[PDB]
C-alpha cells in the first residue's frame, strides 16, 4: 500500500530529497504533512522511489529520489 496522489507524492519527494535523517524520522516528519496517511505506506512509498546515499564521502548521508524523470513527469501534470 502506498501513496498514489500525485500532489501528495510531490510534498513527500519535496521532503525526502536531500534530507540527513533516518528512515524512522523522515517518515514522521511527512506524516505531518500528509495526515491521513499510516507510517507504514509512508515507508512503503519512501522505499519505493528513494534511496539513501552511503557517504562514503566524507559523506553527507542523505535521501534522493531515483528516478529524476518520473518526478518531472508528475510534477508537470500538476503545473
Known sequence: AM????????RLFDGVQDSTFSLGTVTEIAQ???????????????????IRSSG????????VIKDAQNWENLRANAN
Do not use: H, S, V
Not at 3 to 10: A, F, G
Not at 56 to 63: A, H, I, Q, S, Y
Open 3 to 10: 501513496i498514489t496522489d500525485p500532489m501528495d507524492l510531490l
Open 56 to 63: 562514503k564521502g566524507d559523506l553527507p548521508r542523505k535521501w
Open 32 to 50: 505531518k504533512n500528509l495526515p491521513q496517511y499510516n507510517k507504514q505506506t509512508i515507508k512503503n512509498t519512501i522505499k519505493e522511489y528513494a
